[PDB]
Amino acid sequence: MFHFIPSWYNENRTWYDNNYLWYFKPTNVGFDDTINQMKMFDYAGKESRLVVLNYMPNLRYYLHRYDLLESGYYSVFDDIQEIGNVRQQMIDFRQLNWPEGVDFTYTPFIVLVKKSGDLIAKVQFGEEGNLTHIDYFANEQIAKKYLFDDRGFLSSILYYDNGGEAYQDYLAPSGERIMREYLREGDHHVEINPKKAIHFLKLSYSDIEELIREKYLTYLHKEVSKSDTIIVSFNQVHNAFIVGNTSKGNLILSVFSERNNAHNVLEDYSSLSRADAIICDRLDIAAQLKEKIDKPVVHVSPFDTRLALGKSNQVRDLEIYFVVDRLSHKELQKSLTSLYKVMLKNNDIKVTFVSYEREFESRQLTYDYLKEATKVFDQKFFSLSEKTRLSFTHPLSETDIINRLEYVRLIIDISKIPDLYTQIAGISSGIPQINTILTEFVEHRKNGYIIEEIQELEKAIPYYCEQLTNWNRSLIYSIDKINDYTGGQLVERIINSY
């Protein structure tokens, strides 16, 4: 069997929850090499399990999002916290033991719990709508944060004082405290409940990682057979105790350009020399690796098969999905001009402007500018709220993007740094992409079109929207590349490279 170790860490507190507010998701949290690889090992019929090292109270919804909830997992923190096979509960925050007489203010984003004008709490909901945490206040200042597991029990409480974060108590579903992790400058040490010391080598750890190393090495000892393979998400936060201690079985290192600094990879001789094989998502990185060490380096393009393929054949609209992030105002101007021209020539073309920027006021300014710059064309079909053919949207999650791309004909991202997930969705859906730069994702005139100047949109958009033969070449190109990934041949190539 195959043990996958992901890197789904928190940027500012490695071993903590990576969850985000439902309305404020970072663009770099989400689909990655571990998801892609576990799916294809699943498609390939391999036995595999996920080994999660950081605190993940929302893990089951997270896995459900990638059709992996059934894939099997071990969670270090689940083990620590004695969670076991807990009965799932659906927490309705309205039925908690609030102080008598609180009132609820429903905003478009959260619920305020107040008592005669005094803030008691802020209630936060997950992407799937489940209660994730409550910020609990005293004298208008946060006092503690209740963190709820998606199985519907209280997982931990983060206490505050003057001075900010103080410490975090991690609980079992009974409410019993298993351990306390301090959060102050110069003090991140961990205290185990003395009644649980039986299960631990120490009562007091210097930091949370020391305990995580201990739990991992126990997993390695008990659960990895000599004939098993560990597939490790390359990360300096855990390579040393995962790869350094790797004598038990086979090892594959996975290098993912969104996460990994190539220089850091190429410098870690000790990790690379212990790999039986290396995977990465990029051909240039693969080449540097093959240059520097004699190891099998297998290129695995990061397909996301949740995307639907080719459904735009079933609509009369020819919907363009146009990413506006990182474009300057003058680039938006030049773009609107060409979009107007192709749209007067083709009444079926519609344009959805797409902003992935989570910051509210930045997005508002981009929308405000787009509205004003369209007003000048003096035409109702070319306006932003005879009906209009322009819209502006801000997808909140990969699921939004996936839904928004279902019937899309053409992807346009013409900035110098095109959005990565959008590119992945492109090769995963067959939707052709227009870029101004070369990428590993697009072969010119095969599944996309590289324009040298923005006015070349006036050529590139008809090339895929009105000449049907070019669009089907792109769908067919994707379908075959897709199948090296669904068909199991890539997995077998990885496996037999050692």
457 to 302, 412, 440, 450: CA distances (angstroms):
28, 9, 21, 9
According to DSSP, the β-strands at 250-255 and 229-233 are parallel
What is the distance between the alpha carbons of residues 121 and 118, in angstroms, rounded to a whole number? 9
d(CA 147, CA 57): 8
The DSSP secondary-structure symbol of 291 reads H
Strand partners, 229: 2, 250
Resolution, given in Å to one decimal, reads 2.4
For residue 347, what are its two tokens?
């009444």
How distant, in Å, are the alpha carbons of 78, 344, 352, 405 from that of 408?
A: 41, 19, 9, 5
Tally: H helices and E strands in the chain: 15, 23
Kindly compute the dihedral angle of the four CA atoms of residues 434, 487, 287, 237, in this order, to the nearest 10 degrees: 100
Q: Which fold has domain 2-80+210-299?
A: Rossmann fold (3.40.50)
Determine how many CB atoms are found less than 10 A away from the CB of residue 384. 16
Q: Which helix or strand (DSSP H or E) is residue 404 part of?
A: helix 398-404
Chain centroid offset of residue 70 CA: 19
Looking up tokens 């192709």 gives 342
Q: Under DSSP, is residue 335 helix (H, G, I), strand (E, B) or coil?
A: helix
Q: How far apart are CA 347 and CA 387, in angstroms?
A: 11
Helix (H) or strand (E) holding 420: helix 420-429
Contacts of 89 (CB under 8 A, 6+ apart): 151, 152, 153
Token pair of 393 as six digits: 């949207």
- Cα separation, 279 vs 298, whole angstroms: 5
Strands (E), 241-340: 250-255, 277-280, 297-299, 318-323
In the chain, how long is the greatest CA-to-CA distance? Answer: 76
Confirm or reject CATH 3.40.640.10 for domain 311-482, answering yes or no: no
What is the distance between the alpha carbons of residues 442 and 214, in angstroms, rounded to a whole number? Answer: 45
Pairing of strands 277-280, 250-255: parallel
Separation CA 342–CA 461 (nearest Å): 7
- Name the amino acid, one letter, at 233: S
Contact 18, 10 (CB under 8 A): yes
The encoded tokens of residue 403 equal: 């839904």
C-alpha torsion sign, points 84, 85, 87, 90: positive
Q: How far apart are CA 361 and CA 341, in angstroms?
A: 31
User: Beta strand pairing status for 164-171 and 154-161?
Assistant: antiparallel
What is the β-pairing status of strands 118-125 and 111-115?
Answer: antiparallel
Question: Residue 129: what are its φ and ψ, rounded to 5°?
Answer: 90, -5
Can you tell me which residue has the tokens 């049907």? 468
State the DSSP code for 113.
E
Phi, psi of 233, deg, nearest 5: -60, 115
d(CA 295, CA 494): 12
Rounded CA-CA distance 381/426 in Å is: 27
